[PDB]
Amino acid sequence: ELKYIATEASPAKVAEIAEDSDVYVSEIEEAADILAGDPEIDLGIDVTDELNQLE
């Protein structure tokens, strides 16, 4: 049985499946930040001073 555990807790496979998860994690989180990319448009198209009179 130690052989059968060591077949499938193989450190050759533990390290594979751990590395794969990390790449997908940074792929998804950065794909959330470009999903919030529009602040760069909002801060750009509106620069309106005039309301300092309104202030």
Which spans of this chain sit near a copy of itself (rule: CB under 8 A)? 2-3, 5-6, 9-11, 14-15, 18, 20-22, 24-25, 27-28, 30-32, 34-35, 37-38, 41
Smallest gap from Cβ 2 to a copy of itself, in A, equals 4
* Closer residue to a copy of itself in complex, CB, 34/51: 34
Question: By C-beta, is 23 or 54 nearer to a copy of itself?
Answer: 23
Q: How far apart are the first and last CA of the chain?
A: 78
Give the CA-trace dihedral at 48, 49, 53, 54, to 10 degrees.
30
> Rounded to whole angstroms, how far apart are CA atoms 53 and 23?
52
